[PDB]
């Protein structure tokens, strides 16, 4: 029957269409992952229903209860059959769910308000005037918590105890804070989202330095799901036909910034 | 059920796998050095197995003969049960994914253009709109298949030309392509992966360079025979090494740390 797809409202991957309130079903959404889902579904020959993840989180495991939340949790507990969104492939997640080869590449990066005197992660670590944080329940936060790299280790030690909290519930709130903090707050987010933001009004944000790591997003399915194989082959076909590149160019590259 | 030495197939391709100086008096795995030599050691340590490095017999990556339907190169070694795992710059592709297993990528790359410094060429577009400068790719690899299969105008145009060019514009090894670029006084441009291109750009006599953006985006993956029990473990090993930052360290080690062109 119908494949239940869990995804998340994150621009430009999944966004509510203008006048969505009178729309219904899958027609309510638009974005990179909306088009991707349609392409995958066609190649694998299945019907699907897009659903926004209940708690609006990507996926993290509670150290105490050891329960998974976000989209990872919905796959693990059988609430969804597949996840098509900017879900990062990580070791801890790979041990509980299946992932296709990556359909998009990215790396943790730094977002600053134009003019901020910061050029790297190291610069941030050696000062305290400018505050910096990350998104909660995501791979970026986990990256800093787990790093044994001096600089990142130092940055984590600071972030985890900073008051007020430097962590945000959503990417949009992280961006908002950078823009509204007169340069006293830098945000650590993935390059894909960073580059999308610096492309639009009011064109006051900027990505500085190189990415801290190199990785990618993958389409996830419950461990052992029979859907996995077909989806992986589909991702590779779309990659080779150059369709994944076309979708990126479509949803990312305006002119209201210069 | 007893553990036995894992047979690793790989290819002599710098800086992934190279003959160590004094190799003529060394034996086994000690005869080699390189990015994939270090990677194989890391993977083995993490997966807890012993291994034997074996240079692929025909010196090819892997392609299937349209008529006999037989696979050659490293892919053939895995498919026909000659090797237990492949650790080398083997590109993850659809046709290969259909016959063998691949871990998540351990290195990213894209098809690129290598030119002799000074050559008046900035893109694949430039190459397709002229005939003074010849150009080609490596045989039996993903790059040649890319042009053969492209439905994109400019790439289709390049393939129509390359496939019929005389003398042949294709080479059997990367080394042969590099020498052709270096000796053709700017009359030959070579299409190869960004990884190999960037490595050579750091090698003496520093007379070549990468131009334009990459034509595509993909990566190399560690391969195993389809259904092999070794696959799960090595994939997790690749992700761990990735997150510990080791992979980035190895890239810098063999590519830039000791480049011979300064900077
Ligand atoms: C310069 N940019 C590089 C990244 N690409 S991209 O749209 O993010 C893209 C497109 C296709 C693929 C990737 C990224 S990827 O993350 O490197 N994964 C590849 C696959 C294809 C072979 C197995 C890895 C497909 C856009 C252009
Ligand atoms: C700026 N360079 C980018 C490429 N890296 S790299 O050494 O080739 C490298 C290192 C680790 C990984 C890659 C590439 S990758 O091809 O994008 N694959 C990633 C994995 C990690 C999550 C699943 C994809 C690991 C070196 C630095
Ligand atoms: N893509 C991340 C969320 C964003 C972030 O952590 O920066 C994840 O899958 O957890
Ligand atoms: N990495 C390629 C070989 C090099 C090339 O085709 O340019 C392959 O696995 O086929």
Coordinates of C-alpha atoms and ligand atoms in Angstrom, one line a residue:
Chain A
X1 CA 0.0 0.0 0.0
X2 CA 1.1 3.5 0.8
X3 CA 4.7 4.2 1.9
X4 CA 4.8 6.6 4.9
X5 CA 7.6 9.1 4.5
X6 CA 8.9 11.1 7.5
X7 CA 10.5 14.4 6.7
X8 CA 11.1 17.8 8.3
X9 CA 10.3 21.4 7.6
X10 CA 13.7 22.8 6.7
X11 CA 14.3 25.3 3.8
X12 CA 14.8 24.6 1.0
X13 CA 14.3 20.8 1.4
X14 CA 10.7 20.9 2.6
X15 CA 8.6 24.1 2.8
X16 CA 4.9 25.0 3.0
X17 CA 3.6 26.2 -0.4
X18 CA 2.0 29.6 -0.6
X19 CA -1.8 29.1 0.2
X20 CA -1.1 25.6 1.6
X21 CA -4.0 26.0 3.9
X22 CA -6.4 25.2 1.1
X23 CA -4.2 22.5 -0.3
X24 CA -4.1 18.8 0.8
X25 CA -1.9 15.8 1.1
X26 CA 1.5 15.9 -0.6
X27 CA 0.5 19.0 -2.6
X28 CA 0.9 21.1 0.6
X29 CA 4.7 21.0 0.3
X30 CA 7.5 22.0 -2.1
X31 CA 11.3 21.8 -2.0
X32 CA 14.4 19.7 -2.8
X33 CA 13.3 16.7 -0.8
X34 CA 9.7 16.9 -2.1
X35 CA 11.0 16.6 -5.7
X36 CA 13.4 13.9 -4.6
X37 CA 10.7 11.8 -3.0
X38 CA 8.7 12.0 -6.2
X39 CA 11.7 10.8 -8.2
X40 CA 12.5 8.0 -5.9
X41 CA 8.9 6.8 -5.7
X42 CA 8.6 6.8 -9.5
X43 CA 11.8 4.7 -10.0
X44 CA 10.9 2.3 -7.2
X45 CA 7.2 2.2 -8.3
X46 CA 5.4 3.0 -5.0
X47 CA 2.8 5.3 -3.6
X48 CA 3.7 7.6 -0.7
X49 CA 2.4 10.0 1.9
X50 CA 4.6 12.9 3.2
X51 CA 4.4 13.5 6.9
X52 CA 6.3 16.1 9.0
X53 CA 8.1 14.5 11.9
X54 CA 6.0 14.8 15.1
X55 CA 8.6 16.5 17.4
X56 CA 10.4 18.4 14.7
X57 CA 13.8 16.9 15.5
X58 CA 16.4 15.1 13.3
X59 CA 17.3 12.3 15.7
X60 CA 19.2 11.7 18.9
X61 CA 19.4 9.0 21.6
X62 CA 18.7 10.0 25.2
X63 CA 21.7 8.9 27.3
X64 CA 19.5 7.9 30.2
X65 CA 16.4 6.2 28.6
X66 CA 18.3 5.3 25.4
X67 CA 15.2 6.2 23.4
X68 CA 15.5 7.7 20.0
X69 CA 13.6 10.9 19.0
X70 CA 13.1 12.8 15.7
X71 CA 12.9 11.1 12.3
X72 CA 15.4 8.4 13.4
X73 CA 13.0 7.5 16.2
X74 CA 10.0 7.2 13.9
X75 CA 11.9 4.7 11.7
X76 CA 13.2 2.8 14.7
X77 CA 9.7 2.5 16.3
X78 CA 7.8 1.7 13.1
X79 CA 6.0 5.0 12.8
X80 CA 7.4 5.6 9.3
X81 CA 8.7 3.4 6.5
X82 CA 11.3 5.8 5.2
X83 CA 12.9 9.2 5.7
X84 CA 13.7 11.6 2.9
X85 CA 15.3 14.7 4.3
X86 CA 18.6 16.4 5.1
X87 CA 19.4 13.5 7.5
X88 CA 23.2 13.1 8.1
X89 CA 24.8 9.7 7.8
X90 CA 26.6 9.0 11.2
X91 CA 28.0 6.0 12.9
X92 CA 25.5 5.9 15.8
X93 CA 22.6 6.1 13.3
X94 CA 24.1 3.6 10.9
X95 CA 24.0 1.1 13.7
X96 CA 20.3 1.4 14.2
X97 CA 18.9 2.2 10.7
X98 CA 19.9 1.6 7.0
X99 CA 21.2 4.4 4.8
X100 CA 21.5 4.7 1.0
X101 CA 24.6 6.2 -0.5
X102 CA 24.6 10.0 0.0
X103 CA 22.5 12.1 -2.3
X104 CA 24.0 15.4 -1.2
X105 CA 27.3 16.4 0.3
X106 CA 28.0 18.9 3.2
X107 CA 30.2 19.9 6.1
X108 CA 29.8 21.7 9.4
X109 CA 30.4 25.4 8.7
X110 CA 30.3 28.8 10.4
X111 CA 27.7 31.5 9.8
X112 CA 28.4 35.1 10.9
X113 CA 26.7 38.5 10.6
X114 CA 28.6 40.3 7.8
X115 CA 31.6 42.2 9.3
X116 CA 32.0 40.0 12.4
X117 CA 35.7 39.7 13.2
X118 CA 35.9 35.9 12.9
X119 CA 37.5 33.8 10.1
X120 CA 37.7 30.3 11.6
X121 CA 36.6 27.8 14.3
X122 CA 39.9 28.5 16.0
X123 CA 39.2 32.3 16.2
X124 CA 35.9 31.5 17.9
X125 CA 37.6 29.2 20.4
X126 CA 40.2 31.9 21.5
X127 CA 37.6 34.6 22.4
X128 CA 34.5 35.1 24.5
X129 CA 32.9 38.4 23.3
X130 CA 31.1 36.5 20.5
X131 CA 28.8 33.6 21.6
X132 CA 28.3 30.5 19.4
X133 CA 26.1 27.4 19.5
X134 CA 24.4 24.7 17.4
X135 CA 21.1 23.0 16.8
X136 CA 19.8 20.5 19.4
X137 CA 19.3 16.8 18.6
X138 CA 21.4 16.9 15.5
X139 CA 24.7 15.6 14.1
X140 CA 26.4 19.0 14.5
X141 CA 26.0 19.1 18.3
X142 CA 27.1 15.4 18.5
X143 CA 30.2 16.3 16.5
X144 CA 31.4 18.7 19.2
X145 CA 30.4 16.6 22.1
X146 CA 32.5 13.7 20.7
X147 CA 35.5 15.4 19.2
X148 CA 38.9 14.8 20.6
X149 CA 40.4 17.5 18.4
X150 CA 41.8 20.2 20.7
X151 CA 40.0 23.2 19.2
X152 CA 36.6 21.5 18.9
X153 CA 37.0 20.0 22.3
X154 CA 37.5 23.5 23.7
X155 CA 34.5 24.9 21.8
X156 CA 32.3 22.1 23.2
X157 CA 33.5 22.7 26.8
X158 CA 32.4 26.3 26.4
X159 CA 29.1 25.7 24.6
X160 CA 27.7 23.1 27.0
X161 CA 27.9 25.4 30.0
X162 CA 27.1 28.8 28.4
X163 CA 24.3 30.8 29.8
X164 CA 21.9 31.8 28.4
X165 CA 21.9 28.6 26.3
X166 CA 23.6 28.9 22.9
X167 CA 21.6 26.0 21.5
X168 CA 18.5 26.5 19.3
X169 CA 15.4 24.4 18.5
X170 CA 15.5 25.1 14.8
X171 CA 17.8 26.3 12.0
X172 CA 15.6 29.3 11.4
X173 CA 16.0 30.4 15.1
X174 CA 19.7 30.0 14.8
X175 CA 19.8 32.3 11.8
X176 CA 17.4 34.7 13.4
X177 CA 19.8 35.0 16.4
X178 CA 22.8 35.7 14.2
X179 CA 20.9 38.5 12.4
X180 CA 19.5 40.0 15.6
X181 CA 22.6 39.8 17.8
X182 CA 24.6 42.7 16.2
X183 CA 27.5 40.3 15.5
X184 CA 27.8 38.9 19.1
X185 CA 26.6 35.5 18.0
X186 CA 28.0 33.1 15.4
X187 CA 26.1 29.9 14.4
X188 CA 27.5 26.5 13.6
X189 CA 25.4 24.8 10.9
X190 CA 25.9 22.6 7.8
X191 CA 27.3 24.3 4.7
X192 CA 24.2 23.4 2.5
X193 CA 21.9 25.4 4.8
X194 CA 24.5 28.1 5.3
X195 CA 24.9 28.7 1.6
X196 CA 21.1 28.8 1.0
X197 CA 20.7 31.5 3.7
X198 CA 23.5 33.8 2.4
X199 CA 21.7 33.8 -1.0
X200 CA 18.6 35.5 0.3
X201 CA 17.4 38.8 1.8
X202 CA 18.4 40.7 3.8
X203 CA 21.8 39.3 2.6
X204 CA 23.4 40.1 6.0
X205 CA 24.9 36.7 6.8
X206 CA 28.0 35.0 5.6
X207 CA 29.9 31.7 5.6
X208 CA 33.6 31.9 6.8
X209 CA 36.4 29.5 6.7
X210 CA 36.4 26.0 5.3
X211 CA 34.0 23.2 6.5
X212 CA 35.0 21.4 9.6
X213 CA 34.3 18.0 8.1
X214 CA 33.1 16.2 5.0
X215 CA 30.0 14.0 4.9
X216 CA 26.5 13.6 3.4
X217 CA 22.8 13.1 3.7
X218 CA 21.3 9.7 3.0
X219 CA 17.8 8.3 2.5
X220 CA 17.0 6.2 5.6
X221 CA 14.9 3.1 6.1
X222 CA 14.2 0.8 9.1
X223 CA 17.1 -1.7 9.5
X224 CA 16.6 -4.7 7.2
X225 CA 13.7 -3.0 5.3
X226 CA 13.1 -4.5 1.8
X227 CA 12.9 -1.0 0.4
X228 CA 16.5 -0.2 1.0
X229 CA 18.0 -1.9 -2.0
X230 CA 15.7 -0.2 -4.6
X231 CA 16.1 3.2 -3.0
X232 CA 19.9 3.0 -3.1
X233 CA 20.0 2.0 -6.8
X234 CA 17.6 4.9 -7.5
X235 CA 19.8 7.4 -5.7
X236 CA 22.7 6.2 -7.9
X237 CA 20.8 6.4 -11.1
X238 CA 19.6 9.9 -10.4
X239 CA 23.1 10.9 -9.5
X240 CA 24.5 9.6 -12.8
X241 CA 21.7 11.2 -14.9
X242 CA 22.8 14.5 -13.3
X243 CA 19.3 15.0 -11.8
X244 CA 20.6 15.4 -8.3
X245 CA 22.7 18.3 -9.4
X246 CA 19.8 19.9 -11.3
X247 CA 17.6 19.8 -8.2
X248 CA 20.4 21.5 -6.1
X249 CA 20.8 24.3 -8.6
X250 CA 17.0 24.7 -8.7
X251 CA 16.4 25.1 -5.0
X252 CA 19.7 26.9 -4.2
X253 CA 20.9 29.2 -7.0
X254 CA 18.0 34.8 -6.8
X255 CA 19.9 38.1 -7.3
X256 CA 18.4 40.0 -4.3
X257 CA 21.9 39.7 -2.8
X258 CA 24.0 41.8 -5.1
Chain B
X1 CA 34.7 -21.2 10.4
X2 CA 38.4 -20.6 11.3
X3 CA 39.7 -17.1 10.5
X4 CA 41.8 -17.0 7.3
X5 CA 43.9 -14.3 5.7
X6 CA 41.7 -11.8 3.8
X7 CA 42.7 -11.3 0.2
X8 CA 42.8 -7.6 -0.7
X9 CA 42.8 -6.6 -4.4
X10 CA 44.1 -3.2 -5.2
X11 CA 45.9 -1.3 -8.0
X12 CA 49.2 0.4 -8.4
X13 CA 48.0 4.0 -8.6
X14 CA 49.8 6.9 -6.9
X15 CA 49.5 8.0 -4.2
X16 CA 47.0 5.3 -3.2
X17 CA 49.4 2.4 -3.7
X18 CA 53.1 2.7 -4.7
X19 CA 56.2 0.6 -4.6
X20 CA 58.4 1.4 -1.6
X21 CA 62.0 2.3 -2.2
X22 CA 64.0 -0.9 -1.5
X23 CA 60.9 -3.0 -2.5
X24 CA 63.2 -5.3 -4.3
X25 CA 64.4 -6.7 -1.0
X26 CA 61.1 -6.5 0.9
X27 CA 58.2 -9.0 0.7
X28 CA 54.4 -9.2 1.3
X29 CA 52.6 -6.0 2.3
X30 CA 55.9 -4.3 3.1
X31 CA 56.6 -3.8 -0.6
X32 CA 54.0 -1.1 -0.7
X33 CA 53.1 2.3 0.7
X34 CA 50.4 4.9 0.1
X35 CA 46.9 6.2 1.1
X36 CA 45.2 2.9 0.6
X37 CA 48.0 1.0 2.2
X38 CA 47.4 3.0 5.4
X39 CA 43.6 2.7 5.0
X40 CA 43.8 -1.1 4.7
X41 CA 45.8 -1.3 7.9
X42 CA 43.3 0.9 9.7
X43 CA 40.3 -1.1 8.4
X44 CA 42.0 -4.4 9.3
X45 CA 42.8 -3.2 12.8
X46 CA 39.3 -2.0 13.4
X47 CA 37.7 -5.2 11.9
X48 CA 40.2 -7.5 13.5
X49 CA 41.5 -9.5 10.5
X50 CA 44.7 -10.4 8.8
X51 CA 45.2 -9.5 5.1
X52 CA 47.4 -9.9 2.0
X53 CA 47.7 -7.1 -0.5
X54 CA 47.5 -8.3 -4.1
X55 CA 48.0 -6.0 -7.1
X56 CA 45.1 -6.7 -9.6
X57 CA 46.3 -8.9 -12.5
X58 CA 45.3 -6.9 -15.5
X59 CA 45.9 -3.5 -14.0
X60 CA 42.3 -2.3 -14.6
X61 CA 39.6 -0.9 -12.3
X62 CA 36.6 -2.8 -13.7
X63 CA 34.3 -2.9 -16.7
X64 CA 32.0 -5.5 -18.4
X65 CA 32.5 -6.6 -22.0
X66 CA 29.3 -5.8 -23.8
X67 CA 29.3 -9.1 -25.7
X68 CA 30.7 -11.8 -23.3
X69 CA 29.3 -9.9 -20.3
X70 CA 32.5 -10.7 -18.4
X71 CA 33.9 -8.3 -15.8
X72 CA 37.6 -7.4 -15.7
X73 CA 39.8 -5.5 -13.3
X74 CA 39.3 -5.4 -9.5
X75 CA 35.5 -5.7 -10.0
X76 CA 36.1 -9.0 -11.8
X77 CA 38.4 -10.2 -9.0
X78 CA 35.5 -9.8 -6.5
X79 CA 32.8 -11.1 -8.8
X80 CA 34.7 -14.3 -9.7
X81 CA 35.8 -15.0 -6.1
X82 CA 39.5 -14.3 -6.6
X83 CA 39.6 -11.6 -3.9
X84 CA 37.7 -11.0 -0.7
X85 CA 37.7 -7.2 -0.7
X86 CA 38.9 -4.2 -2.7
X87 CA 40.6 -1.2 -1.1
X88 CA 41.5 1.3 -3.7
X89 CA 40.2 4.4 -5.6
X90 CA 37.3 2.4 -6.9
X91 CA 34.4 4.6 -7.9
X92 CA 30.9 3.8 -6.7
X93 CA 28.6 3.4 -9.8
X94 CA 25.2 2.0 -10.5
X95 CA 26.4 -0.9 -12.8
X96 CA 28.9 -1.9 -10.2
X97 CA 26.6 -1.6 -7.2
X98 CA 24.3 -4.1 -9.0
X99 CA 27.0 -6.8 -8.8
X100 CA 29.1 -6.0 -5.6
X101 CA 28.7 -4.4 -2.2
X102 CA 30.1 -0.9 -1.5
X103 CA 30.7 0.8 1.9
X104 CA 29.8 4.5 2.2
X105 CA 32.4 6.6 0.4
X106 CA 35.8 7.2 2.1
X107 CA 36.9 9.9 -0.3
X108 CA 35.0 12.3 -2.6
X109 CA 35.9 13.3 -6.2
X110 CA 34.6 14.5 -9.6
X111 CA 35.7 14.1 -13.2
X112 CA 38.0 17.0 -14.0
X113 CA 40.3 18.5 -16.7
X114 CA 44.0 18.4 -16.6
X115 CA 46.0 20.7 -18.9
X116 CA 49.6 21.6 -19.6
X117 CA 50.1 25.1 -18.0
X118 CA 49.3 27.8 -20.5
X119 CA 46.8 25.8 -22.5
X120 CA 43.9 28.0 -23.7
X121 CA 41.1 25.9 -22.1
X122 CA 38.9 26.7 -19.2
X123 CA 36.1 24.2 -19.4
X124 CA 34.6 21.0 -21.0
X125 CA 32.6 23.5 -23.1
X126 CA 35.9 25.0 -24.4
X127 CA 37.2 21.5 -25.3
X128 CA 34.0 20.6 -27.3
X129 CA 34.0 23.7 -29.4
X130 CA 37.5 23.2 -30.9
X131 CA 39.7 20.5 -32.6
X132 CA 43.3 21.8 -32.2
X133 CA 43.6 20.2 -28.7
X134 CA 42.9 16.5 -28.5
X135 CA 41.6 14.9 -25.3
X136 CA 40.7 11.5 -23.8
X137 CA 40.3 9.4 -20.7
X138 CA 41.5 6.2 -19.0
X139 CA 40.3 2.8 -20.3
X140 CA 38.0 0.4 -18.5
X141 CA 36.9 3.0 -15.9
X142 CA 34.1 5.1 -14.6
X143 CA 35.3 8.2 -16.5
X144 CA 35.1 6.6 -19.9
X145 CA 31.7 5.1 -19.1
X146 CA 30.5 8.6 -18.0
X147 CA 31.0 10.1 -21.4
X148 CA 29.7 7.0 -23.2
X149 CA 26.4 7.2 -21.2
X150 CA 25.8 10.9 -21.0
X151 CA 22.7 12.3 -22.6
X152 CA 23.9 15.8 -21.8
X153 CA 24.7 17.7 -25.1
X154 CA 28.2 18.9 -24.4
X155 CA 29.3 15.5 -22.9
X156 CA 27.6 13.6 -25.7
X157 CA 29.5 15.8 -28.2
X158 CA 32.8 15.1 -26.5
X159 CA 32.2 11.3 -26.6
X160 CA 31.2 11.3 -30.2
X161 CA 34.7 12.9 -30.9
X162 CA 36.8 10.8 -28.5
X163 CA 35.4 7.4 -29.6
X164 CA 36.5 8.1 -33.2
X165 CA 39.7 10.1 -32.7
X166 CA 42.8 8.7 -34.5
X167 CA 45.3 8.1 -33.0
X168 CA 43.4 6.8 -30.0
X169 CA 43.0 9.4 -27.2
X170 CA 42.5 6.8 -24.5
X171 CA 45.3 5.6 -22.2
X172 CA 45.7 2.4 -20.2
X173 CA 47.1 4.0 -17.1
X174 CA 46.9 7.4 -15.4
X175 CA 50.7 7.7 -15.8
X176 CA 50.3 7.4 -19.5
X177 CA 47.8 10.2 -19.6
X178 CA 50.0 12.5 -17.5
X179 CA 53.0 11.9 -19.9
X180 CA 50.8 12.7 -22.9
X181 CA 49.7 16.0 -21.4
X182 CA 53.3 16.9 -20.5
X183 CA 54.7 16.1 -23.9
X184 CA 52.1 17.4 -26.3
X185 CA 53.0 21.0 -26.0
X186 CA 49.5 21.9 -25.0
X187 CA 47.9 19.8 -27.8
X188 CA 46.5 17.2 -25.4
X189 CA 44.2 17.6 -22.4
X190 CA 43.4 14.7 -20.0
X191 CA 40.0 13.9 -18.4
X192 CA 40.5 12.3 -15.0
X193 CA 39.2 12.4 -11.4
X194 CA 39.8 15.5 -9.3
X195 CA 41.7 13.4 -6.7
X196 CA 44.4 12.2 -9.2
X197 CA 44.4 15.6 -10.9
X198 CA 45.2 17.5 -7.6
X199 CA 47.9 15.0 -6.6
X200 CA 49.8 15.4 -9.9
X201 CA 49.4 19.2 -9.7
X202 CA 51.6 18.9 -6.6
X203 CA 54.3 16.8 -8.3
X204 CA 57.4 18.0 -10.2
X205 CA 58.0 19.4 -12.6
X206 CA 54.8 21.3 -11.6
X207 CA 53.8 21.8 -15.3
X208 CA 50.1 20.8 -15.1
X209 CA 47.0 22.1 -13.5
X210 CA 43.3 21.4 -12.9
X211 CA 40.9 23.8 -14.7
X212 CA 37.2 24.5 -14.3
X213 CA 34.8 22.8 -11.9
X214 CA 34.2 19.1 -11.6
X215 CA 31.8 17.5 -14.1
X216 CA 30.1 15.4 -11.5
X217 CA 30.1 14.5 -7.8
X218 CA 30.8 11.0 -6.4
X219 CA 33.2 9.0 -4.3
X220 CA 35.3 5.9 -3.8
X221 CA 34.1 3.0 -1.7
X222 CA 35.5 -0.2 -0.2
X223 CA 34.1 -3.1 -2.1
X224 CA 33.3 -6.7 -1.2
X225 CA 31.6 -9.6 -3.0
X226 CA 27.8 -9.3 -2.9
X227 CA 26.4 -10.6 0.4
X228 CA 29.8 -10.9 2.0
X229 CA 29.8 -10.9 5.8
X230 CA 32.7 -8.6 5.8
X231 CA 30.7 -5.7 4.4
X232 CA 28.8 -4.5 7.5
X233 CA 31.9 -4.3 9.7
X234 CA 34.1 -2.5 7.2
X235 CA 31.3 0.1 6.5
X236 CA 31.1 0.9 10.2
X237 CA 34.9 1.2 10.2
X238 CA 34.8 3.7 7.4
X239 CA 32.3 5.8 9.3
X240 CA 34.3 5.7 12.5
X241 CA 37.5 6.7 10.7
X242 CA 35.6 9.5 9.0
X243 CA 34.3 10.9 12.3
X244 CA 37.6 10.7 14.1
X245 CA 39.0 12.8 11.3
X246 CA 41.6 10.2 10.3
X247 CA 40.5 10.1 6.7
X248 CA 41.1 13.8 6.3
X249 CA 44.5 13.3 7.9
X250 CA 45.5 10.6 5.4
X251 CA 44.5 12.7 2.4
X252 CA 46.7 15.6 3.6
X253 CA 49.5 13.2 4.4
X254 CA 49.7 11.8 0.9
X255 CA 48.6 14.8 -1.1
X256 CA 49.9 18.0 0.5
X257 CA 52.2 17.4 3.5
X258 CA 55.0 16.6 1.1
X259 CA 54.0 18.3 -2.2
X260 CA 57.0 19.1 -4.4
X261 CA 55.5 22.4 -5.8
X262 CA 55.8 24.6 -2.8
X263 CA 53.1 26.6 -1.0
Ligands
LIG1 C1 29.7 21.4 -6.4 N1 28.5 20.7 -5.8 C2 29.0 19.5 -5.2 C3 27.8 18.7 -4.6 N2 26.7 18.5 -5.6 S1 25.5 17.8 -4.9 O1 24.2 18.2 -5.5 O2 25.4 18.1 -3.4 C4 25.7 16.0 -5.1 C5 25.1 15.4 -6.1 C6 25.2 14.0 -6.3 C7 25.9 13.3 -5.3 C8 26.5 13.9 -4.3 C9 26.4 15.3 -4.1 S2 27.4 13.0 -3.1 O3 27.1 13.5 -1.7 O4 28.9 13.2 -3.3 N3 27.1 11.5 -3.3 C10 27.1 11.1 -4.7 C11 27.1 9.6 -4.9 C12 27.3 9.1 -6.3 C13 28.2 7.9 -6.2 C14 28.1 7.5 -4.7 C15 28.2 8.9 -4.1 C16 26.0 11.7 -5.5 C17 26.3 19.8 -6.2 C18 27.5 20.5 -6.8
LIG2 C1 38.2 19.3 1.5 N1 38.4 17.9 1.3 C2 37.1 17.2 1.1 C3 37.3 15.7 0.9 N2 38.0 15.2 2.1 S1 38.2 13.6 2.0 O1 39.5 13.2 2.6 O2 38.3 13.2 0.5 C4 36.9 12.7 2.7 C5 37.0 12.3 4.1 C6 35.9 11.7 4.6 C7 34.7 11.4 3.9 C8 34.7 11.8 2.6 C9 35.7 12.5 2.0 S2 33.2 11.5 1.7 O3 33.5 11.0 0.4 O4 32.4 12.8 1.6 N3 32.3 10.4 2.5 C10 32.3 10.8 4.0 C11 31.2 10.0 4.6 C12 30.9 10.3 6.1 C13 29.4 10.3 6.2 C14 29.0 9.4 5.1 C15 29.8 10.0 4.0 C16 33.6 10.6 4.6 C17 39.3 15.8 2.3 C18 39.1 17.3 2.5
LIG3 N1 21.5 17.3 9.3 C1 21.6 17.2 10.8 C2 20.7 18.4 11.4 C3 21.3 19.8 11.2 C4 22.6 20.0 12.1 O1 22.8 19.1 13.0 O2 23.3 21.0 11.9 C5 21.1 15.9 11.3 O3 20.8 15.0 10.4 O4 21.2 15.7 12.5
LIG4 N1 38.2 5.5 -10.3 C1 37.9 5.0 -11.6 C2 39.2 4.9 -12.5 C3 39.8 6.3 -12.9 C4 39.0 6.9 -14.0 O1 38.1 6.3 -14.6 O2 39.3 8.1 -14.3 C5 37.1 3.7 -11.6 O3 36.9 3.2 -10.5 O4 36.8 3.2 -12.7

